[PDB]
Amino acid sequence: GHMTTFLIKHKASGKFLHPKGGSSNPANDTNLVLHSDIHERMYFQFDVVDERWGYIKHAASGKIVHPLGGKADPPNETKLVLHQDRHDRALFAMDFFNDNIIHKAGKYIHPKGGSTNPPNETLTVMHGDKHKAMEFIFVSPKDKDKRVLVYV
Amino acid sequence: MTTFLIKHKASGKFLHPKGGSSNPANDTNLVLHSDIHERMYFQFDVVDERWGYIKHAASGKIVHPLGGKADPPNETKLVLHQDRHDRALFAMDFFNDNIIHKAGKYIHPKGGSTNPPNETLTVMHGDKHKAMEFIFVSPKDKDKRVLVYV
Ligand SMILES: OC[C@H]1O[C@H](OC[C@H]2O[C@H](O[C@]3(CO)O[C@H](CO)[C@@H](O)[C@@H]3O)[C@H](O)[C@@H](O)[C@@H]2O)[C@H](O)[C@@H](O)[C@H]1O
Ligand SMILES: OC[C@H]1O[C@H](OC[C@H]2O[C@H](O[C@]3(CO)O[C@H](CO)[C@@H](O)[C@@H]3O)[C@H](O)[C@@H](O)[C@@H]2O)[C@H](O)[C@@H](O)[C@H]1O
Ligand SMILES: OC[C@H]1O[C@H](OC[C@H]2O[C@H](O[C@]3(CO)O[C@H](CO)[C@@H](O)[C@@H]3O)[C@H](O)[C@@H](O)[C@@H]2O)[C@H](O)[C@@H](O)[C@H]1O
Ligand SMILES: [Ca+2]
């Protein structure tokens, strides 16, 4: 009966996850990108569905993060997008102990190409690898260095 | 509801107040035991992001290192105590499956066995290994994990 609001910060670069174009209501299938700007159209919330699993929700639109096409077991390099649909293939967990975002089928959210310092507008993709450039922390919109609990 | 069982992953035993009371006294040891009942249900009261109080549901007492030191040494016994303060802050790491104190040590079965006998004490220890792993499960489905951050 309450969801915190937070920024998803790419730990190595200090950039954040955005809908591409920064819209308050991104069209379905809008890519999830990295970008350095901060504003309320890149705020997110986490809608808990089942223990660790839930929906990464764009605060302004209510659309949530999907592997493009909604496959349950997406291959490496599957693009992440926003979409209004809510179902089990858009379930992720926000690992705030190991600092990563993991999909229910076991791959992680990465910047495409795996750079520690990706350009603005770099796409995000699913990938099974674990390394410093797929780490993310979840921080206050009022203080981008203050971690906040996404599970309440 | 918001209650859960703290299950020792390797043995399937659970965290209990020693003696299984609904109203354990201050400084009652936290032990491992195979039984299940409402007097071994726990809750977690969030204080600051990941940090909070591990709470015995029936009594409201919370988990402390015995003596309440900020940086307790290895083998410090865990107990229940009504006091609230920052040396009783833990985080419930449901990704690595362990319970970590604010100063960085973890809750262990004393002696570190993957199959501790009933009534084995719990202690703080800085090492990480299979036998200090815990998962947090539904009272009505002892194999179903539940979210302790509420
Ligand atoms: O991408 C996340 C989305 O995946 C699934 O929906 C895919 C896509 O289907 C529809 O688009 C069409 C069908 O009209 O299918 C292809 C692309 O797959 C397009 O040529 C065409 O527009 C929907 O209209 C799209 O919005 C949708 O993204 C899945 O069904 C969704 O739940 C969601 O997971
Ligand atoms: O996208 C996330 C993924 O990025 C990195 O892997 C990218 C890509 O690297 C390799 O492809 C090539 C092989 O020639 O290696 C360079 C590095 O990008 C590319 O120019 C070229 O396409 C792998 O063979 C691909 O499978 C891989 O997807 C990073 O290494 C991954 O850990 C991950 O972060
Ligand atoms: O164990 C957790 C508890 O540790 C600290 O309290 C220690 C101890 O204090 C009182 O015990 C006695 C006897 O009444 O009082 C002195 C210290 O004031 C101790 O040497 C002696 O044992 C309490 O009656 C005990 O319950 C308590 O264990 C800390 O102060 C507490 O906040 C709590 O963290
Ligand atoms: Ca749950």
From Swiss-Prot, chain A:
Residues noted as binding D-galactose 1 in the record, renumbered to the chain: H18, G21, D37, I38, H39, E121
Residues that coordinate or bind D-galactose 3: E77, H110, G113, D129, K130, H131
PTM (free text): Glycosylated.
UniProt keyword annotations, A-Z: Glycoprotein, Hemagglutinin, Lectin
Binding site for D-galactose 2: D29, H66, G69, D85, R86, H87
GO molecular function: galactose binding
Signal peptide: none
Regulation (activators, inhibitors): Hemagglutination activity is not dependent on divalent cations. Hemagglutination activity is highly inhibited by D-galactose and N-acetyl-D-galactosamine, and to a lesser extent by raffinose. Also inhibited by melibiose and alpha-lactose, but not by beta-lactose or D-glucose.
Glycosylation sites noted in the Swiss-Prot or TrEMBL record: N28, N76, N120
Domain of life: Eukaryota
pH-linked activity: Optimum hemagglutination activity at pH 7.4. Retains its hemagglutination activity throughout pH range 3-10. This protein is most stable at pH 7.4.
Temperature dependence as stated in the record: Optimum hemagglutination activity between 37 and 40 degrees Celsius. Retains its hemagglutination activity up to 60 degrees Celsius, but loses the activity at higher temperatures. This protein is stable at high temperatures over 80 degrees Celsius. The thermal stability is increased by the presence of ligand D-galactose.
Subunit structure: Homodimer. Likely to form large oligomers; oligomerization enhances hemagglutination activity.
Stated role: D-galactose-binding lectin. Also binds N-acetyl-D-galactosamine. Has hemagglutination activity towards all types of human erythrocytes (O, A and B) and rabbit erythrocytes. Agglutinates Gram-negative and Gram-positive bacteria including E.coli DH5-alpha and L.plantarum ATCC8014, respectively, and has bacteriostatic activity against them. Also agglutinates M.lysodeikticus. May be involved in innate immunity by recognizing and eliminating pathogens.
Protein name: Galactose-binding lectin
